[PDB]
Design a protein around this ligand. Structure first.
Ligand SMILES: [Co+2]
Ligand SMILES: [Co+2]
Ligand SMILES: [Co+2]
Ligand SMILES: [Co+2]
Ligand code: NA
Ligand code: NA
Ligand code: NA
Ligand code: NA
Ligand code: NA
Ligand code: NA
Lengths: 331, 331
């Protein structure tokens, strides 16, 4: 198959390097804690309850370990609450391995004023490249905790000039270190584009995972993204009917077709779940209850995998998506 | 003249209440420390140097006190680096009185994802009202440090539906507590609108200061804002040629005309200066040097006031803008 080619480090979780073989079954895109940019501005009424958060998260972590999931990739952008030290707390308490990211969110949902501004004053791309490179080879906020992946995100209608500063910095870093890249696609679009862009910028397709691909239901769109030899991820499984987002029945339709055409080695599955919100706890409006009912990290282990298997998917296919793939991609 | 009418507390600086008579000459809109939303995401390479920052800021503070300026209103939005405890450090070290704000920035330069999101899920206006009310009557992040003013900001083309959530919350709070409101106008527009809106929402025009009014050079625009009986502020004096922003020569042209028509009691003067940047220190491109040369907090005391006086402005007019007005408005 296609093996990563070029410089390579070692999967750097928030508690240290780990050999690819030790990653085990993995959820490639989740969020232990998250907060939309501005949550910090609601600190007075939406303060972080460390004790409550640490207890809640370790609880969830132990439930994953109970299901054989040994590793989780936390994809929280630098502006969206990323807290390595805490993540490390959760990891050290449970034994769950967690990698964290480096990067900012798409123009519309990230804390974009800062670099959008620096961009007008100078070489922001280079500045972003330096931050990424440092966070992936030395550590974050000087804690010694390195990022295990670079997270990129784009908007619906295009990968904006601001978002591209980040794709270029990432490519530089991916080329230089071999670190993996996971991405966020907005409302099921730009998947092929990020693939064309990253590969054209020289980033290794074998270390690239185009995210939120379940956000699109036309399998032609997936087949086109996969042409670039990158991995794609149905990573919001469980979130049904919010922000474009299709139903799982729909996601599984596509998946069984792609699996049916031999794409097992390029497909990963996650929830993009949030275990503990930062800011004021979200007020889930009555009509939205069903949309998020299966939007938790135990959904794939308990509902999805059994559903694929009983449909014809093999134990080997499930094993390739949940263990094989994360192994080669982050390992 | 027009005196504040309705409930009223006491000017709440970051070190306690202070009688209006004790405010002295004041700079109604400055920023001891600031950071565009996202600066926190650049923590690894743009970390906060407390010692260096505390030394730099107290230095600046002492320079203001040396010029008779006894009070500064820090207008930093909740997402833009607001740090009451630190502000209090600077105040306690020098004796400079500082009030801090409560509020978020305009849709385009603030950390707007959070509430723009909560807005779609529920009654964000009410949530924002609660935060504001608490921060102005009880304190911020539970530190006991209360906000002395509510800061509102709008965009260039309109006061957006998101920005209006904030104008409505503020109005509620202004009506209920009597706390002052200072605002940010984008690229010299919406001044009359914020005035129409706030007053129509029942906020006291005698506790309202429409900001960044020097951003517009047509005095017809000022005269129309002033019709609502609110105060207007040429509060970016010193920033010349960046983000619309006119030249001081131009700002003074308008000012001497407004002063010439008897508007002394409704005009305030500030710099919207930043004493210490949060994040990676800003890279000032060669061509921009002149634009920010006079963009520091000693500019009005040393250059502006002497310029007005030598033009015909009286010691009493200068005294009304720099001492009288802040006294009634924040006192
Ligand atoms: Co995403
Ligand atoms: Co996510
Ligand atoms: Co402003
Ligand atoms: Co300002
Ligand atoms: Na558990
Ligand atoms: Na971000
Ligand atoms: Na793969
Ligand atoms: Na000094
Ligand atoms: Na803000
Ligand atoms: Na006034």
């Amino acid at each position: 198959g296609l093996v990563p080619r070029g410089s390579h480090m070692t999967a750097q979780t928030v508690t240290g390097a780990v050999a690819a073989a030790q990653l085990g079954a993995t959820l490639p895109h989740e969020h232990v804690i998250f907060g939309y940019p501005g949550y910090a501005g609601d600190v007075t009424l939406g303060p972080f309850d460390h004790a409550a958060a640490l207890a809640s998260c370790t609880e969830t972590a132990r439930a994953l370990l109970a299901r054989g999931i040994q590793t989780v990739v936390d994809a929280t952008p630098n502006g969206c609450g990323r807290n390595p030290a805490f993540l490390r707390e959760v990891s050290e308490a449970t034994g769950l391995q967690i990698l964290c990211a480096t990067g900012f969110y798409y123009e519309g949902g990230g804390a974009t004023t800062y670099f959008k501004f620096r961009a007008s004053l100078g070489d922001a791309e280079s500045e972003i490249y330096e931050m990424m490179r440092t966070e992936v080879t030395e550590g974050i906020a000087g804690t010694g905790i390195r990022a295990g992946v670079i997270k990129l995100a784009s908007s619906r209608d295009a990968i904006t000039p601001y978002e591209q500063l980040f794709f270029r910095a990432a490519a530089r870093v991916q080329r230089e270190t071999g670190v993996p890249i996971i991405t966020h696609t907005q409302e099921g679009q730009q998947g092929p584009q990020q693939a064309e862009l990253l590969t054209s910028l020289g980033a290794d397709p074998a270390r690239i995972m185009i995210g939120h691909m379940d956000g699109n239901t036309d399998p032609a769109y997936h087949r086109e993204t996969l042409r670039h030899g990158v991995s794609i991820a149905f990573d919001r499984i469980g979130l049904q009917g919010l922000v474009g987002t299709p139903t799982d029945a729909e996601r599984l339709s596509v998946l069984t077709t792609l699996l049916g055409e031999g794409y097992a080695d390029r497909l990963l599955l996650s929830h993009d779940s949030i275990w503990h919100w930062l800011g004021r706890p979200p007020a889930i409006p009555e009509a939205a209850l069903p949309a998020v009912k299966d939007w938790h990290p135990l959904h794939i282990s308990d509902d999805i995998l059994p559903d694929l298997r009983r449909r014809g998917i093999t134990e080997e296919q499930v094993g390739q998506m949940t263990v094989g793939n994360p192994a080669r991609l982050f390992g």
